[PDB]
Every structure is written in structure tokens, then in C-alpha cells.
């Protein structure tokens, strides 16, 4: 793991996350990871298109309705490797949607393996935050260190 450059039964708790991966067992284990640590609201979905429509909705709603929190995830862990739009351009295309409303999401890339060097480069194109391995185990450190900066 770590940040890309431009008990904790409550470590998460208030925050709402998506987690977004074509792998069904991958997905749920991810979602099992922030669960037990108290993360109010997860959502999920297989694969960049479903992503793309949650947070392209949701920052709508919210903006319409002048919610106070206008971002409708805290956190997206994205899986780098999906067949048709990949995490890299899903990460991309939310980017897009965001510029119109002046937020930006922290988007936590997560991959099987380490990347080498066309997926790190693809990382920092594509505007993500961080990289973890796909048991999440380094989760609340990549968070916090996001959170600190």
C-alpha cells in the first residue's frame, strides 16, 4: 500500500463507502473489512459503469438538494482490473463528473498485485489517491494518511 501522489469497531463510523469490483468474493470481503469497522453506510457494485452512475446520481441529489455533505461516498476503493472500463478510467470519468461541482472523492485503487511501472503511471493519470492490496489490510493506515493530508 500506499498514497499516490498528485479494536476498530468505529475507525469508519459516520463515513459511507462504495466499493466498487467485477469479482463477487473480492467485493464482499472488502465490504465485510469496513463493516466490522463500523462504516455507517457501504454500497457496492461489480463493475466502473455502475460506479460512474452512483456517484454521478448521487453528487446530483446532493447538489439539487443542497445537502450539507455533498459528496455521496467518503471513500471509493476501486478494483484496478474490470473487463470494459477499468478502475484507471472508472477513477477518471468520476474525476470528470466531480469537476463540475468543485469536490473531489478519495479513491483507494485496489489491486491483487503491486503495480508496476504502466499501472502506477495510469494511477496518477487517472487521479487516484492511494493503492492497497485486495484483503484491505493496510486500509486504516491508507486512511488515515489520506486524511492528513
Known amino acids: 500500500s ?17 466499493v466498487v469490483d467485477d469479482n463477487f468474493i473480492s467485493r464482499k470481503v472488502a465490504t ?10 457501504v454500497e457496492q457494485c461489480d463493475s466502473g459503469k455502475e460506479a460512474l452512475r452512483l ?5 446530483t441529489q446532493r447538489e439539487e438538494q443542497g445537502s450539507v455533505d455533498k ?7 476501486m ?13 477518471r470519468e468520476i474525476r470528470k463528473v466531480e469537476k463540475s461541482y ?31 492490496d485486495k484483503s484491505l489490510n493496510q486500509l486504516a493506515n491508507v486512511i488515515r494518511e489520506i486524511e492528513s493530508k
Open 71 to 77: 459528496l455521496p461516498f467518503d471513500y471509493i476503493f
Open 79 to 91: 478494483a484496478c482490473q474490470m473487463p470494459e472500463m477499468d478502475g484507471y478510467e472508472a477513477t
Open 55 to 59: 456517484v454521478t446520481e448521487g453528487l
Open 2 to 18: 500506499g498514497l499516490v501522489p498528485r479494536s476498530d469497531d468505529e475507525f469508519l463510523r459516520g463515513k459511507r463507502v462504495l
Open 102 to 132: 468543485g469536490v473531489r472523492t478519495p479513491i483507494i485503487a485496489v489491486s491483487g498485485h503491486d503495480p508496476g511501472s504502466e499501472e502506477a503511471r495510469e494511477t496518477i493519470q487517472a487521479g487516484m489517491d492511494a493503492f492497497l
Open 32 to 41: 465485510g473489512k469496513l463493516k466490522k469497522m463500523g462504516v455507517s453506510e
